[PDB]
């Protein structure tokens with residue numbers, strides 16, 4: 001290299017795109033374990049919990065037992081205030097774990113005491129250290145009771161204050177995607193949706209695909225993404241891409257009017273035969289549903305184990321104006 005280049009290269013050393021995924025509580029730890037095992041690209045995994053038992057069986061690059069003094073390696077018994085206090089007690093440890101992150105993804109299942117209470121604290125620390133802060137959480141199933149939903153919605157309001165983009169997945173809508181879903185599989189299905197949303201979002205940024213995804217562009221869209229919801233579709237039919245995206249756009253997970261969306265993140269995943277043209281069609285389709293002024297970030301990657309199905313992850317941002325937060329859940333205005 002040359003003097004100019006050598007300098008630049010060194011610059012590239014300091015600069016980067018450090019991404020960290022933080023799973024709080026049992027549901028959050030379960031998600032992290034999966035990401036670590038199946039291997040998530042270009043991202044560090046961090047699991048935190050008050051419950052030492054759940055944490056020890058979890059798998060991640062780093063684990064943080066929060067609230068030692070407060071809970072003594074025990075769970076929060078459903079009390080969000082314990083999770084919040086616990087996270088505060090361990091702020092320094094959490095800070096050390098996500099310290100040099102350019103972007104932090106916070107994931108958990110809202111409704112319990114740990115995830116609900118600590119997620120907002122992790123988010124506050126994430127922004128204070130200057131990282132693009134994104135949350136991807138789930139709301140509980142109706143069958144879990146109103147207390148769990150209230151605590152979740154309150155935690156959702158608190159989280160909303162400290163995140164740059166808050167992606168919310170309504171577990172209850174999973175029953176609209178698979179009507180005859182056996183209760184014993186309800187959480188195994190939610191698990192699948194959570195992983196696809198988080199891994200899908202993370203890899204859209206870190207995984208090499210048929211087209212480059214610029215981190216700066218991702219920042220611009222998510223810096224003020226506000227409240228976001230997802231849509232998931234997949235098809236192996238003649239018009240794989242067309243059907244997949246149609247499924248995503250009509251997904252019950254995307255429970256809101258999207259015409260008033262400020263932006264979107266689109267991740268097209270398919271087998272080795274996936275072309276840029278299919279991905280283009282997915283994006284073209286989505287763009288016609290959103291405001292003509294919305295910013296759309298998209299990518300297309302190859303998923304080794306897909307065979308001949310194309311999957312589409314959609315993330316519509318800035319829909320807070322079309323949603324209302326109630327103690328019973330999210331309601332479309």
Ligand SMILES: Nc1nc2c(ncn2[C@@H]2O[C@H](COP(=O)(O)OP(=O)(O)OP(=O)(O)O)[C@@H](O)[C@H]2O)c(=O)[nH]1
Nearest residue numbers: 025026027076077078109111112113114115190191
């Ligand atoms: N996908 C998924 N969601 C889960 C699972 N377990 C529970 N949930 C959901 O996540 C919410 C919070 O549960 P946990 O993560 O177990 O709770 P916690 O944050 O650890 O809180 P405490 O046990 O009170 O300390 C529940 O209300 C369910 O909606 C799981 O295995 N997978």
